[PDB]
Amino acid sequence: ATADAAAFPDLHRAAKLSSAAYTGCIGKAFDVTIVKRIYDLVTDTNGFVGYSTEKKTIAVIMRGSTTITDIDIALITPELSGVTFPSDVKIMRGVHRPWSAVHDTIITEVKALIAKYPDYTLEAVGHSLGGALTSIAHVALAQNFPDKSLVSNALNAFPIGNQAWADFGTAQAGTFNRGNNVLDGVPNMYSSPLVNFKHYGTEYYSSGTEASTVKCEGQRDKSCSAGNGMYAVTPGHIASFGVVMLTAGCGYLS
Template sequence: MRASLPLLAILSSLIAAGFASPVKRGISSDVYNDLVFYFQYASSAYDSTCAKPNGNTLVGQFSDSGTDTQGFVARDDSRKEIVVALRGSSDAVDFWTDAQVLLEDFTSPGTTPPAGTSAHTGFLNAWNSVAAQVISTVKSQLSSHSGYTIVTTGHSLGGALSSLAGITLKQNFPSSPIRMYTYGQPRTGNDNYAFWVNDQFGANAFRAVHTTDGVPTIIPTSVGYRHHGVEYWQNPDPPSASTTKECAADGEDPTCSASVPSQGIDLAHTIYFDILATTPFCS
């Protein structure tokens, strides 16, 4: 039986559409559980008195009064990890940092970025205000815990700082395995920055976005910014491995969270995996 030309045309268009926009399926339970686990560190960074982050050893805290940048370094001896967690926005100084959106040349201790790499002025200044403290603490921990993996994590502003911390620590400790986790991270740098992070981290960068969270797209690509990968879009609720999709590896996937117009800071930004950001996991 011969198919009519109209039918063939319809089938061809459906097949083409399928190849152009593949269906994104849920992630593994291991990846999902890790996204939740490292969010608990990011959430705990809002608590300046967190004695046992995620039940693990608090190595030390770091801060800068000028930029109001804060966080901690923890050590998980069961997972053999050194975790750097950076606090998100919590006061007027942080929101001023968020507002410094001009791009500036990327510089950070011990790094050699590709030519033309630039980052958000406020985020970069905030990270650089504590970078030396973090590098020194991580170096000390690696000297006594050889082979441990470095992990950076943060929510919102802390997510941007986690990205900057991740690439800086990757450059400073090239022989150490490293992963970064960010939650509700705004775009942090230009195309060259995103390409650099993608090249250095590949699948070891995890950028989670909750449903309609408007912060990841609040700084548009039209002003020279670009996201790095890999986005994990948890949509729709309720959160689970099956409702969390791995998006295009380059970071800018129009079928994931970028498909939702930004409404700025909304309820979705404040809750990830049914956990209110700022909830401490400290015992």
């Protein structure tokens, strides 16, 4: 890993937006005006779609679980509208199922927003399960909207598929970032050789400050999550880039 303080402001924003999704902010989440509220009861999938006039983006913000204290890790062949998966790609059902429940609703709203704001770029963000969802959202958006710039920020996320999945994620135009925190073992789930799920993207890592922010080398840099000695839901999971989930508020008076 190498120092990359310059990465911190965008990841800090991503963490604020992710916190807003847990809070259930009304009208807006910081600079994002929320135009559509995404909800699936059975999969408890929640999130927001909207636009930022400040950033000139159309944003998909996914919530994590309402509890972190079960998830289906059976690998399945995924199927999503507007996405063409190679035959060997497999994703865990516990992420494909909730995403597939909301996929068409999200794509439809993004397409409507693109018509209204045709110069805006795309972004996707979320924390924990919301970050795992963002790792599929990245591919859904890249495949459905190949003429749009795209940046996705998955925070504190576990990996969701096999090597063919990770390779397919890497193949997409657009930038997928995995922003992780000290003292959090969730990104280390499913790393055992017998299970062998694979990350993609560029990992960034911090202890909550700009100065501590690094850009990691490869998927499992031992200076970042892979080396932190943690597994699953440990104390650092609740925070990302200086934001403790649920404590950011909404930016109402900013």
